[PDB]
């Protein structure tokens, strides 16, 4: 394997075998030099216009990293359709990673002309953090993924991390990390890199909706043998005290005894899609739903999984309580409503409470002959025995996994942006250009060398994931709901390039179409 | 195999062994970057000056493809002569393909000076579509073949395809294809590519003419024992009704009973080579012979195989009903009659009807004593039991095969431009330069990379086809007609270069010289 | 369904090496006779040479779903598309497989040329249009001709200097070499099999 032989081939394919499917993707990347080969302290503090909520302390490194953690990395729109229409669930099993056909290039400036040449003896260096010894920066939903469309070339993002801070300052427990203090592999243009990984057992993502609601599980034809208190007061003659009792039945179903409870609630503020129906004020931050950690307020975004709206409320959404994707060429700041794509969790109404409404009612007081009953409203409810709930849905544009924090305890460790929680997630992959010094002085100086040759590198990357499928077995007589493409004529095809060669994704696509009994 | 060793050799040869011949060709190619590495939506619609007949919707890719589908790719004029003079038929058997001695080159502009350098670490990528999963664009008689003359260097054509349209717009069933979504092989300058293919059983092309005509198959010396109706009216005395009957014989041969029928007819409009004999008007489109598909009119070019003209009519040809080749350096649009070469199907008069004339006559009405017989003219005739016909001839400049459309049914699936119809034709071969990014910015941006280094590639291509021959076995006493070269002196040699180094082909050469009994 | 149409199989980016007759008459100066020739290309695609032909045609009469657009008369039987067997006329129902309508014609259907299912509790005789369910074969436009339109145009005569060209319209077309076609679709309410008649010969024995 010299300079004249390729170290790998292009693999983009999908294979559907029985109970599993295997996806494989190849992309072309470009890796710049970051920071001028330097580590740098970064911070932000309230001395400037920053509020206390936004302060941080950390470091930016001279390293890049690979991110394949979105679904459109591994699935074409047609492959995603086969998955969601035919299956009740899926989970990842194992992956392979390859890095090959590396070429390092040097650029030099003379006056205004720029030239690029090959540097055949330069290296890049790569390693995986397989012992989870670095701050794990995947799972924060950052940009810099492998592109959804296989013909696009992408830039590799810069690695950095945060530590503890007090304001803009570091405390005694703050940690610093040098990535050169890790063994890594060095590659010239004829070398290549690969590794394999196995996922730990994780539950299947549930791709389906319930065809029953938690409060409707009864037989509509039969009475219950249990009684409830239907009457505290005599109707006949005057008004007087009595105890009446009735059995629950077809017309009283709201009164019947039940075995189960809806899932937990943390209430969100309601926002209409028609702006004229909203109050006139800027309440996005002040009315936002937050948590409070070490004197510092953080918006709970999206939060726990709750139904977006109830029946015929579709114009409302929770303020910070949903995932929002941008359309192609949308602005970074202050984008309009026509520029973004709002997801809906509406399928989970059958089980989870609605995000913008109360959980229920409890008794505020005890009552007497002289004191009337008082009722409270429950806007926040933690886990109660007998609750059942659904997780948030996953999307073709959305994240796949997250790393579960290493802690004494946790409760239902499913990521709140949606995905698979993992104690040992796929390891993060660090990549860097090796610095090449410019000619030094001819007399010894002990200071470090600050003058380098300008370089960048390009190459190929492949990733292959095996997925396990859960087949749908159902006696439903009538046809299902399916994801489909519009039949009518159009100026362009959805999920294709336009006249200018730009690939766009028209809408977000969820996973829940087939149904199952509750 | 490094940068200093060649990955293949030059093979151009022909070998005649018994019942088979093997041809092999080598050419030099050049592959540009197309579209700036982009896929692009293309369309045409009636909003502009385009009529509804010419509308389309589709995509152009950044890929090239190889086309060897003309006969002059595989045969020298002398080899074609050996074939057509000595054999009654031939068909293809198997082929081999090689791609070797690849070299990638980078071109950079500084002011007005241009320089070209080798880029030793760059790749090209190649694949064959062997599962027939792409729109099959061969068999449309496009330019971009391997040149007929082995010393010429050719440019590789750009790949593209069409989908369904309504006007300039796409409908719901329109498909988009990314060719990067196919596994492909990547080659640096020291690598090479090859594959083999086997043709499915196909009938021999018939290279011969019939020495008998379908209506002359009788013994000229003997009467038939069958009778026909020769007389409806009394000749003697006055005019009166009678039924006369006669046996068919040597002088009545037009009246004899026969077992067979001429092939099908779709009539063409007649055009004289002497312009003064044609009507004065532009009737090429308005008088053209067409079919009508989804509200959109398409000229039937050339159409079903019919004889070009009858005896002593040689000055006439069917309007859109023949193949027309251009001479060397002929114009693209509005070329003169001396610039083009008209083929003639005249050999099939013995069987197929003439293209510009009616099929026959049928009865229009039933007759009575008061009603005289009425006759209709048959200008279009589909398949009747007892028909026999010949296919259109093949030429040294013409196509070899076509892909048979995948459909519920078809009738006599022989391509109408002439050739071998194939359910699984030789697979199409896609080739592309791998994009090499220019130096990116030193701070991360998430947009795709639009800036590249300009490159192109060159190399060698070999193709080898084995052909099976059908030997001629004949008791004819007198000598045959043969294809020959003119004996008389000339300014240049036919099928050679001129003073300027330009190779030309003087005339089209068909396959049908030897004869056979009908 | 096919995602391509039989007349669009070409590469949109490239010219053909074959020529066609584009010009019978001189544009410049006066009107005079000449022979012009052009190569087929991206903008001329209707003129290009092709290898294949659409399937066979037996034309049907056209009926609009909006009754106000139909002629005023009872033409169902008299304008019906028939065959004639032993002196006895039989409506050809549904007939050979043809596309129900072309683009943006969806309001039209062939008279006896489609399958029609009734809704629940529909009348036996003289049911209304809201009582029945019309199928559509529209998916086969890419290959088969439309049921209510002509197959194509052929030459009626030979031409001379004194005689102008005449064109005929082809309303019925049998099998030609190079045709391809699709069968009629099957439905959840429809039949599964049929018995092929026992005969000396048949052509494409699909029910
Ligand atoms: N996505 C994901 N990753 C990891 N752990 C998860 C996830 N979703 C749920 N869980 C946990 C929550 C419970 O401890 C357990 C389910 O218990 P059994 O009754 O199935 O699995
Ligand atoms: N060129 C070509 N390719 C493919 N199929 C073809 C071709 N020419 C004719 N045919 C078909 C037509 C008939 O179905 C069959 C001949 O039947 P049997 O009596 O020989 O072969």
Author numbering:
A (entry chain M), B (entry chain A): 220 to 737
C (entry chain f): 428 to 634
Copy text from the publication.
The VP3 region forms the capsid surface, with a number of features common across AAVs. These include a pore at the 5-fold axis of symmetry, essential for DNA packaging during assembly and externalization of VP1/2 N-terminal domains during trafficking; depressions at the 2-fold axis and surrounding the 5-fold pore; and protrusions at the 3-fold axis, often used to engage cell attachment factors, including glycans and the AAV receptor (AAVR).
Importantly, while the AAV880 variant remains largely dependent on AAVR, the AAV840 and its evolved variant AAVhum.8, which carries additional mutations to aid with NAb evasion, showed nearly complete independence from AAVR, implying a receptor switching event. Utilizing 275,883 individual particle images the AAVhum. capsid was reconstructed to 2.49 Å resolution. The AAVhum. density map displayed the characteristic morphological features of other AAVs, e.g., a channel at the 5-fold symmetry axes, trimeric protrusions that surround each 3-fold symmetry axis, a depression at each 2-fold symmetry axis and shows high similarity to the previously described AAV8 capsid. Compared to AAV8, the capsid structure of AAVhum. is highly conserved except for VR-IV that displays major structural variation with a Cα distance of up to 3.2 Å. This difference is caused by the evolved sequence in VR-IV, including a single amino acid deletion that results in a slightly shorter loop relative to AAV8. Notably, the newly evolved VR-IV residues comprise of a highly conserved putative integrin recognition motif NGR, also located endogenously on most AAV serotypes. Additional structural models highlighting the AAVR footprint, as well as the newly evolved and endogenous integrin binding motifs, were then analyzed. These surface and roadmap renditions of the 3-fold symmetry axis further corroborated that the VR-IV integrin motif lies adjacent to the AAVR footprint residues without overlap. Compared to control cells, at least 10-fold less virus was bound to ITGB1 KO cells, whereas only ca. 2- to 3-fold less virus was bound to AAVR KO cells, indicating that AAVhum. binding on Huh7 is highly dependent on ITGB1 but not AAVR. However, it is critical to note that the AAVR residues are not mutated in the precursor AAV840 variant, implying that the newly acquired VR-IV NGR motif alone is sufficient to enable the switch to ITGB1 from AAVR.
